[PDB]
Amino acid sequence: KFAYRFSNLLGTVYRRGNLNFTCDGNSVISPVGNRVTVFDLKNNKSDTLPLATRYNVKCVGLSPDGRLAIIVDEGGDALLVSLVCRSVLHHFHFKGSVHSVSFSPDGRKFVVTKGNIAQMYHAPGKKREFNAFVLDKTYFGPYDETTCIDWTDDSRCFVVGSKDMSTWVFGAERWDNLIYYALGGHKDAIVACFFESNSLDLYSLSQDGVLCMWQCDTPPEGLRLKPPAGWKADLLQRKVKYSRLAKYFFNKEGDFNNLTAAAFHKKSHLLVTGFASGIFHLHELPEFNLIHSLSISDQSIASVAINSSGDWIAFGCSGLGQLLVWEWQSESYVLKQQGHFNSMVALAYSPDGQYIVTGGDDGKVKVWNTLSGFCFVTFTEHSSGVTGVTFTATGYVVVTSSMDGTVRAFDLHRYRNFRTFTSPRPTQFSCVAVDASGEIVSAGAQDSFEIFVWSMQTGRLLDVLSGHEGPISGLCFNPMKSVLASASWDKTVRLWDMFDSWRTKETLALTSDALAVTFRPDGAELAVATLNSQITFWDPENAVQTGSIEGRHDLKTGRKELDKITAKHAAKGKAFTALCYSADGHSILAGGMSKFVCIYHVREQILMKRFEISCNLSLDAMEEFLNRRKMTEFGNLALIDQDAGQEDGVAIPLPGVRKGDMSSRHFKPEIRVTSLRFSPTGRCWAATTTEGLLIYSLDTRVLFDPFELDTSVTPGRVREALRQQDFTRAILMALRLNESKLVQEALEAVPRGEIEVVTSSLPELYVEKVLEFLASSFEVSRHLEFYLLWTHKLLMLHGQKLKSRAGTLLPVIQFLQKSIQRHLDDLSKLCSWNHYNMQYALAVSKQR
Template identity: 25%
Template sequence: MPDVVDRVAEHIAPALIYASRSLSQHLDHTSYSEKISTGLRALLQEHLLYWLEAISLLKQMGTASKVFASIHAWVQAHDADLAAFAKDAIRFVETFANPISHSVPHIYLSALPFAPTESLVSKTYLPQYPSAARFKVGKLDRWSAMLKTFEEHTNVVWAVTYSPTRKTMLKTFEEHTNVVWAVTYSPTRKSIASASEDRTIRVRDTETGEAVGAPFKGHTAAIRSIAYSPSGHHIVSGSDDGTVWMWESETGESVQSPLKHGGIVHCISYSPDGKHIVSGSSDGTICRWDAETGEPADTPIKGTYFAYSPDGSHIVSSSGRTLSIWDVKTGEAVGAPLEGHSDRVNCVVYSPDGTLIASCSSDHTIRLWDAETRQAVGVLEGHTGIVQSAAFSPDGARLISGSYDKTIRVWDVKAGKPAGAPLEGHSSGVYSVAYSPDGAHIVSGSGDGTVRVWDAEAVGFEAAGAALQGPSNTFLSMAYSHDGASIVSGGFEGRIQLWDGDTGQLRPLPTSGHRKGVNAVAFSPDGTRIVSGSDDCIIQVWDVLTGEAVGAPLEGHTDVVHSIAYSPDGSQIASSSFDGTVRTWDVKSGKALSEPFNHGGSNRVWGVAYAPDGMHVVSGGADRMLRIWNIKTGEQVRALSGHIDTVACVAYSPDGTRIVSGSCDNTVRLWDAESGEAIGSPLLGHNEMIESVAFSPDGKSIVSGSRDQTLRMWDAETRELLGGPVKVHSDWVMSVAYSPDGTRIASASWDDTIRIWDAAKMEVSADSDGSAEFSHDCKLENGWIVTASGQLLLWVPPWNRQGLLWPSNVALIGHSLTELDLADFVHGSDWVSCKADAKVVAAKP
């Protein structure tokens, strides 16, 4: 609406503008009265949505929750029902501030329909809007623990922090040109400093968000860590260039010559008294420097990550799998190292009172230690991936942890047990967690590019996000059985699971799985066996009915097994590995059939596939080549060149005449299997590496899946895109496959889901003008369902996104379903008709 500013000025009275901005301040200085309470009740229970319209148009959505919080505090002692409504209104506006501020109609189109069933706002207003979106399945009964999601980042979020006042949590800074590795508040609370992969430090005013001076420049590589001095006058930074710099916090001028480490500086801090700077490096040392002179204060101690005790008398450090406690005055270790972890320690933290130390590790556990006796006092187990970060609550009663398994877990420190269900909602690993100073909220930063705020008090109730079908899965691989009745999947956590190919329901398959991620799975042609290949370098055959291992593991590869395939007659298995080789195995004996086929040197081999005649295999690797091998002789038949980066995946056409390949150069290519010549030009469209390719059973179509989160269908003859790219997954598409009858396509993703698609619907090209309806060619972007014509159809809250059933989805695996009923849904220019009385008015002559 081009004249929206003028229309707002014309139709919204100055008194309403003033009231919208100042109501909370007036309430804070007004004694309770029934008359005012009656007016507030009318505002909330009769006019709330209209008031939100005005607030949105005035660009004042940030004030809404403050107003409701003031109302809640003002009436709490006098009117419990109105206080409850005000509290629910706070949740409503905090959850849906994004769509409401972006587009006023989505108060009615998105916020009301997606509010939980038990929400008082929803109960009061939704019945008045019969033509809003409805749920067939998947609507929450009550508010989740997730309070807010900040989605402005376009890359991994590695660090998060609360302001000391808790009034502000990271504003959006868009000036950095690469990953932001660290953020911190100044002791005065007036500034925030951020450090980035772009080699700069930027300082912003907390209130205005304006830059304070120019970027700090000097480092020659990514800056990993920063810290303010206790006085706030200086900032220190640690970088991949192996140096520590000290800066004037206001001018950005360097204070002294860089302090040097022999490796990446991962961790940096001031001592509590400000007299020393401490830095931890990948060179295996933690150094203390005199903050005035820059001279070493003592001999470096062993370690990489560290934390000061609250009183500044000790430092705890991690080195590999062990921890050590050091006396700051003497520089001596206090007792022997603390041992117990079976893999690298990634983070160490002291409890607020200094009595406990928590360490989190790549062994998937958090360990608790008595800081005085140095004895282990507990092991917190539950994560299924690397634990990257941890933080104590301000009172020390709880500990939170963030993991590569995409969850945040909250632990009762005294009991040594979970304090509730995991907080789920991130679609990638959780790299940073923090408590608010009052302990009421938890904030998390993730590889999915979002920062999320959680209600710490709601942890004991249902966790945010729809419940998964069993433990969280990050799918790395997937394959159909030859009758199409089953799908097998391999996960990042090492699990192998079996699913119904029609319904997506989990089937019993009690395998022990692998110790590490399962990159490849395949069914035997007769459907009685499954073979899997893993990061643990092992290949294992499994009985489909019992889940038992069949024979000993096939061992010989010395690095990650990345791809695997059965021969057409089921007598052989071919595997490719990052050790640079392709191996073939006899299924009955479990023995290697020949010497490995070598891609040359240390070039990783990513993909392998059998020719339909079973006489040849094709492989693709980091040498940018496809190589065809004769199984019987072990000789290379021909090499296919054309890709300009790693060949990540390969597949034969059903008749064996063509090969399709996907590459890290973001292209898909077709090849003549006999001549080795490229067929036409590359298939262009993906903007990140191709993880998986497959031919349809009739050889007429190709499907590709990419790290750009899309899958695309191509005509194998014309090499044209069929329909548009399908962007529904919220993370990398790791594996794609056609069902044996060609009617369905399955796509497995890092986002914890496998989606099964109707292939015929996906092949239909979008209308030339672009559809404005919910169809397979819609995209899911930052929670918005965007139609082919570019219209914002609906905003979907984070807990409903992963399980949202798309129109061309037949089934969804890995997450409980969200299915919408849009039969009576009105939107676009007709959105005003979603209200009951609007239809009556419209029907009158």
């Protein structure tokens, strides 16, 4: 029944770490908090890898072959993964914090810099052992923490920068002339250090903004092995110089712009450097020629990387989580995205199910395309945060309500805010609701305790509905009846009739305060979440309570770091705050301040399933029992870590702010699922949480769901029937199983001209199954008009019979419709653009 798998994490493109391009250079690997996303610029795609971690990713090491990758979190745990199979190979635990990880270009060794040391390991082999990496050697040079790594293209020596403003260079294996060498000449921390294309000459960049060039007298092939000695000699019996050529300044005197990130392409001799002020510079190193410079953002530039070809440069800004890919030769952006952390609070689906509109505390409205995964239009008309958002039932119109006191409607045809509604009295709106017809727009207030209703076409205030006591928690229109249900904090849910001459109103009294209201898709049942964590299902027309669900125990909630009370005491005072019916309505999804979303069976009033949103342990309140290891005699001492986290700067933490830049507890926010929504199609659902926008989609692999099995029903008999040309029976047996590949083969085996016989012989029950499979088929199948003929025949045969039961087939038809719509539109754009144009040419030749 409820077989859904996580598919993508929209809404966030960069949190922290270093950026890396894939080996071919088409895709970019970006850390998004807990996870890793690959953006394929070649095909306009974004996919999040299924892997999850305990803490945020600090380092990403990418193998030269492209098959392997190493992902390390802040806690020190490391994960060896294959990019080809998108699956985790093996696990490891580095003892201390690792600043960076770099693979040798040959592909045999990699260096891990941690604490004051750098350890060089072999690359993982084909042999499988419980311990993944065999440590090879250790180097213990610098005074203080090591920062960066670089390797010579001959893989003979490597270089490590340090925090103690000295740069150390080591040899891959013991050279007689070069065991190690040290470099000074700087007065601040080293940010990066590189090597020439085919020499050991190096560059050192300091945080102050100084670049130093070091040149040695010995060619890299001049390195000679140490003479064997010790016990090898017993078996057998039976220095370089560096000089500072040049020193360059990236800034004018009197300006303090700290260098923060650097990247260097050897073959083109190209340097790209990003500074604390948000500007980056390009240079050609041996002459230090400034090509051009840009300003990206007010925030600093955290990480910078350049692809193999050298055309694309990647920039990340952790201040707003902004990711940018820049092509310097074309002077244009390839990709540019921005998403603030913890911003999103709202969610909606288009009626087709193709787009998702969200609003955040920042005040921005964003529309995302679920297939591509990228935002394509953003509206900034609102000044303060957006509390609610909704699509109209028919048009491509999005309506938002904000703390500005305004409810604005935007069109997607012309991309303009054509209508704005405001109250006569200055009040702040908390939610929005729009009728299915789209004529009526409604909103509720934080303080004025009254619902405002406006007309869409005219734009005047139709009415103010009063009677509630306390703020309005939520509103919802009945999809089929055009009545408005609003819940308030006076333990009441009120029903308002709009197209009624006598203004009939209903009240539904509750034991405790109400928080949310939702209608089933048909509109005959209503759900209210109350403060005692109960979900009550009512019949709106008769005002009778059909059922109730107790859900306090299921919402497993964990203690925050600063909470004096325990988990149970806090849980006794928290309830569900987000509800959403399934497409069919047989199940209900509930969520709140926890990492769990609970799916209940409404009729049985039992919990079918519990979904874990995240396992990131760098987010507050995830785990019920805090670790005893961190306790000391004076307490857990959370304020030390609080100051360390707020050392990010950018703003100044302010007392009493729960959320935002000025909030002190911003580095580790609490885990909260702000909202849930289900696709009208019924093939996926989404949730807005602190981590981002989460998409869960149907995947057949998760669960096996046969319909009517028999000992006779088997793929052997299916193919036997196929060889015997009894197509109908093979189709029926392939449909009794719910395997997509077998029914795919069974349908594709049929030659044309026998379609109508098969369609006529099909019984009524299998019609819905065939339509579902055809709808799934149009997305990923090459054979367009074959399935067009199939769909045409079944529809023209069974439309009249499907009309009577059209009520229960809504999630299917919607699905099918949009798929059949999609391809059609592009063809209608292109083919006609040929036809008439060609005819026009054929006209001109005649007049000559």
